[PDB]
Design a protein around this nucleic acid. Structure first.
Lengths: 97, 91, 77, 252, 112, 135
RNA sequence: ACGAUCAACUUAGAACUGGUACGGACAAGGGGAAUCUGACUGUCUAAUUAAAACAUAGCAUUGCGAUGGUCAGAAAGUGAUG
RNA sequence: UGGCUCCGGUGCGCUUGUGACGGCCCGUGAAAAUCCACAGGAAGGAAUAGUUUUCAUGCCAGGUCGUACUGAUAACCGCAG
RNA sequence: UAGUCGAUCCUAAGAGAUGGGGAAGCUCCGUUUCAAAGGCCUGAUUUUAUGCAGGCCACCAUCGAAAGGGAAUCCGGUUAAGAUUCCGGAACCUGGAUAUGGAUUCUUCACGGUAACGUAACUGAAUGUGGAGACGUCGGCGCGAGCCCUGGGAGGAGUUAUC
């Protein structure tokens, strides 16, 4: 569904992980999509929802906490928010975002 | 190795207190002294003190919970009951 | 209780109209590992603390003893 | 001949409670205009251990609506209230675990606790850990509500009384054995002077009505009437039956 | 060795009556009564000790200048920086979000 | 895309000026020799103009409507950018990297920034920038 | 992977030797097979009883939903549990 | 009247103070005075000089009562050294 | 022989007035209680002495710990007997006064640092909030102090029949 698409992007596209790196890639306007985990704090989620409407970047909420998002992108650690800056073979920028 | 065959932590009590009572205290000390998942920060750092209190080591939170486990089985159904009851107010 | 590194600050203190007593002490200490030489300490008595001035090279010390105001009562050693 | 122990716990000399390390009373919010017309939001700063109480408290802090200051109030924490949760007291407050609502505003089957008997006595019924009442019916004529207490006694109260949603934190506290005597000592050193309990058969007839003998035996029948004189009531009081109970649960 | 005595007239080992043993310029060991150790000021929110503040006993703070009791932020000597940072971010974003709550009800109330 | 253009309003979130609204007069997204990161030159106000009301006499209006400005270098991680804006073309060429150290030029910048913000406080376009963010 | 160089004691073994001694003084467990009894740690008859007695955790019973159950007060616009 | 009063080293050492931890709990282990800080913005203040004693220095004053000695096989209680 | 030690001040478990309620009464209950339970800074001054025109705030006796909380000192000397008290020197705290500098200011109430924060100073009332006072016990580890042990060196005493 969405996790197979994240695997195809994570093996065939360009991404970034973390919060500070997504804010640095989002101020520079390179960020094409952000995926935010469910158990992020709501202050953090509102600060990423506010930077996105300054940069017109679409936001996809992720059902499931940061552990499942860490498992989804092929990594082992946890990740609160992922920013896709280049898509791969898939078209998740233009599917339903 | 595995130093005790079947007592575990209740081997600190020793020869005293019967067998069924030490088995029963073992069942709840394996829940009590365990380290649980924090639902917010996602880190397995929830430990307890002060029965009914579950302080996360990081993250500064504190969940009032069950006395030996984070949410006891007769409580976690109750919120699901609330999930049944709050939906009828709108639809 | 205090120590002063500046010379002109010490000369500002000697004319502060509360300082009635000063004293000059001559210590006999040894430089780096070899030699005995003559250290001097100028101690002026302010009304709260006792200010001092540590002079190791006595070629400044003879000029500074001459540079004290003569109305100041000086205890020599 | 002598005054016996239960007659002696009433003067309140050494049998008084041990309240030094207790945080305060565990009341609800004093019912005012904001709570019986709208809602009011308090943040939970610090859920704390109460000394002598199985449940943990919750120090919810509210904004004083009439003077600029903050009033701190000590609820009994329901199970699953993380700190930083907004707790909404009042009539129009939504139904989430930790909010405190009038009983006429909830549907039946709702598992609430710390519920008032009369509207405004600030938390009388269902306060100890694990317990809860269950609203089993409404009677909207003369605004009554029919609930089920933790003992299994059904009771009709007024629908202006307030209950906080959810079971009480600290549940399952007496499922663990208390293996040693010192652990019961350190339990009862923070409540009152009611431990160790000497058996009344083990003492003399001056000390107790069961006292004395060449064998340790009760004497006459150990069930004492409800209408006996204060001083005989040492045994079983007004027992309608006795013996090891027999019968399945969920009675009519 | 040289065995030492209390100097005051309190013979018990309380928290006020502590002892350090000092060699004095007469050569002899002698006791010194030591005040209780001062603790750092803490944040009221996260409990961490907040820095830039001299750690003194509570009536010592009236003998000191104001720059040993303060840092140069808003909420200077009271809250640590991160918490202050958070209560700017939140206290900005809600007072942007609330404006969204004033722009929705100009339209939903008008399209009814 | 890019939203750190030279007219954006930001809120300073770190430092002595934390919680004070500024405008980015000259961005540096790449960085310089000093400040080895993406910094910016902002101009803001240190003391907000107080709430004058209908009943103040005119002279007591003045000592309420004063403005104490500041120019500052600030990292991009120490600003909240926002959707509000402010026209900076009055003092766009005044505040630059050359306006810094040899600090006597900083006060020459502060006078121009103070006069610009007071003249924008009259005829009260950009009302939001002049009100204290209460936190 | 070395060279120089410096302080600690701990452990293991080998010879040699003593009128076969050597934890040389001091210090310092007697042990086993069972029965009756109380489970235990604990506690009391301070000036004859320290126990199998009392307590204990464990089990079970009874009363009571506060205009309440147990109890105090000579009363009270009283009080203990609370 | 003179000299010297100097240079070092080690530690499962003893005692003591503390820092960060870790175990314990159906025990999670005082209160008030006192002092400080921040938020807040009343009020007051410019330069021919008004503001500043939570900056440096200076000045003045700190009252009452106890204070000796033993604290024990002779100073206390046990009739008594 | 005390500004610095303690008592003094604070509250703890508790005691105990006032308002009230009993009791024939001696006295009993209760302590924030069915009580109209008091002070605080600015203006009015140049009848005004410090009253009055307001703006506020409401706690609500008092006692109770020379082992708990707490503002402030040390060394050396000294007597037949006192010393953290006296004497010499060196400090610190609280309260009150006023000046001299320095600082700020026509950007009237400071600048620097990206920041964490720093600078001898660098207005700020009512009201509110936070911190300190404020804290169990056990275990090992790190650091520090004093003692102990030890080397070289600079003195004085003892041993020497031998070493």
């Amino acid at each position: 569904s969405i996790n197979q698409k994240l695997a195809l992007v994570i093996k065939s596209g360009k991404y970034t992980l973390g919060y500070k790196s997504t804010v640095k890639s989002l101020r520079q306007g390179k960020s094409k999509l952000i995926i935010i985990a469910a158990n992020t704090p709501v202050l953090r989620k509102s600060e990423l929802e506010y930077y996105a409407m300054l940069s017109k970047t679409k936001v996809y909420y992720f059902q499931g906490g940061n552990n499942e998002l860490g498992t989804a992108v092929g990594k082992l650690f946890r990740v609160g928010v992922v920013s896709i800056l280049e898509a791969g073979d898939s078209d998740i920028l233009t599917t339903l975002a | 190795a595995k130093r005790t065959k079947k007592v575990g932590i209740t081997g600190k009590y020793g020869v005293r207190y019967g067998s069924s009572l030490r088995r029963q205290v073992k069942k709840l000390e394996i829940q009590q002294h365990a380290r649980y998942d924090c639902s917010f920060c996602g880190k397995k750092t929830v430990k307890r003190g002060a029965a009914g209190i579950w302080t996360c080591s990081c993250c500064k939170k504190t969940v009032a919970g069950g006395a030996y486990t984070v949410s006891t089985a007769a409580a976690a159904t109750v919120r699901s009951t609330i999930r049944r009851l709050r939906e009828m107010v709108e639809a | 209780a205090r120590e002063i590194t500046d010379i002109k600050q010490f000369l500002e203190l000697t004319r502060r109209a509360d300082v009635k007593t000063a004293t000059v002490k001559i210590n006999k200490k040894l430089n780096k590992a070899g030699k005995p030489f003559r250290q001097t300490k100028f101690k002026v008595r302010g009304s709260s603390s006792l200010y001092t001035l540590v002079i190791n090279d006595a070629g400044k010390a003879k000029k500074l003893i001459q540079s004290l105001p003569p109305t100041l009562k000086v205890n020599r050693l | 001949g002598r005054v016996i122990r239960n007659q002696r716990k009433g003067a309140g000399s050494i049998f008084t409670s041990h309240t030094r390390l207790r945080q305060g009373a565990a009341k609800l919010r004093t019912l005012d205009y904001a709570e019986r017309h709208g809602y009011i939001r308090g943040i939970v700063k610090q859920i704390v251990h109460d000394s002598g109480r199985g449940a943990p408290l919750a120090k919810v802090v509210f904004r004083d609506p009439y003077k600029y200051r903050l009033r701190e109030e000590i609820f009994i924490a329901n199970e699953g209230v993380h700190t930083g949760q907004f707790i909404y007291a009042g009539k129009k407050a939504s139904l989430n675990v930790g909010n405190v609502l009038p009983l006429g505003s909830v549907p039946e089957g709702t598992i609430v606790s710390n519920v008032e008997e009369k509207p405004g006595d600030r938390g009388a019924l269902a306060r100890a850990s694990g317990n809860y009442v269950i609203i089993i019916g409404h009677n909207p004529d003369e605004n009554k509500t029919r609930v089920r207490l933790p003992s299994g006694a059904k009771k009709v109260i007024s629908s202006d009384a307030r209950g906080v949603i959810g079971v009480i934190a600290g549940g399952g506290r007496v499922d663990k054995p208390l293996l040693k005597a010192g652990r019961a000592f350190h339990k009862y050193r923070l409540k009152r002077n009611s431990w160790p309990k000497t058996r009344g058969v083990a003492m003399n007839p001056v000390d107790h009505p069961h006292g004395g003998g060449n064998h340790q035996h009760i004497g006459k029948a150990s069930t004492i009437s409800r209408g006996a004189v204060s001083g005989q009531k040492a045994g079983l009081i007004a027992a309608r039956r006795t013996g090891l109970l027999r019968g399945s649960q969920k009675t009519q | 060795a040289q065995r030492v005595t209390f100097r005051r007239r309190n013979p018990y080992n309380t928290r006020s009556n502590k002892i350090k043993v000092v060699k004095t310029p007469g050569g002899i060991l002698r006791a010194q009564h030591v005040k209780k150790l001062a603790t750092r000021p803490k944040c009221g929110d996260c409990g961490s000790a907040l820095q830039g503040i001299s750690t003194l006993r509570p009536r010592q703070y009236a003998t000191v200048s104001k720059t040993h009791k303060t840092v140069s932020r808003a909420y200077g000597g009271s809250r640590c920086a991160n918490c202050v940072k958070e209560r700017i971010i939140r206290a900005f974003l809600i007072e942007e979000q609330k404006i969204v709550k004033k722009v929705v009800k100009e339209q939903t109330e008008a399209a009814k | 895309a890019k939203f750190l253009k030279a007219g954006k309003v930001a809120v300073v979130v770190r430092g002595r000026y934390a919680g004070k609204k500024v405008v980015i007069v000259k961005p540096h997204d790449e960085g310089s020799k000093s400040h080895p990161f993406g910094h910016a030159l902002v101009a803001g106000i240190e003391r907000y103009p107080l709430k004058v009301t209908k009943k103040h006499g005119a002279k007591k209006v003045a000592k309420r409507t004063k403005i104490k400005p500041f120019i500052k270098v600030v990292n991009y991680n120490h600003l909240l950018p926002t959707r509000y804006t402010l026209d900076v073309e009055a003092f766009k060429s005044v505040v630059s990297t050359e306006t810094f150290e040899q600090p006597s030029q900083r006060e020459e910048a502060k006078k121009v920034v103070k006069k610009a913000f007071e003249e924008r406080h009259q005829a009260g376009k950009n009302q939001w920038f002049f009100s204290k963010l209460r936190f």
